[PDB]
Structure 1
Amino acid sequence: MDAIKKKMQMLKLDKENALDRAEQAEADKKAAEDRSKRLEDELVSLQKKLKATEDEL
């Protein structure tokens, strides 16, 4: 019929919206986790430099 087609269109539009939001959230999560692991490496490096300075002291 006709209204069934409208329902089919609507039931896919929200699917597209959800997929777009999912992609955005995935990108943001990956970027944040990469920054966090980089800061972990930074903290390890800072600990090593503190240890070396304590050795010189």
Structure 2
Amino acid sequence: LKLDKENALDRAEQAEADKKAAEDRSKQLEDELVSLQKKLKGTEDELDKYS
């Protein structure tokens, strides 16, 4: 039916939306691995300045 495709599509479309959300989380987490690594190296560069 249209309801089988709509439910399978709601799963696929929501999975694409969840891929957007999962990608939003993973890309933001990669941006924040850069933020964390950059602030880790901010702190490391500052460790040397304080050391």
TM-score (norm 1): 0.60
- Point out 4+ residue stretches in structure 1 off by more than 3 angstroms: none
Give the percent of matched residue pairs that are identical in Structure 1 and Structure 2.
96
Larger Rg: 1
Structure 1: tracts of 5 or more residues without a match? 1-10
Give the paired residue count: 47
Classify 1:44/1:21 alpha carbon distance in 2 versus 1 (closer, same or farther; 3 Å): same
Measure the CA separation in 2 of the matches of 1:55 and 1:18: 52
Structure 2: tracts of 5 or more residues without a match? none
Measure the CA separation in 2 of the matches of 1:21 and 1:13: 12
TM-score (norm 2): 0.65
> What is the RMSD computed on CA atoms of the aligned residues?
1.7
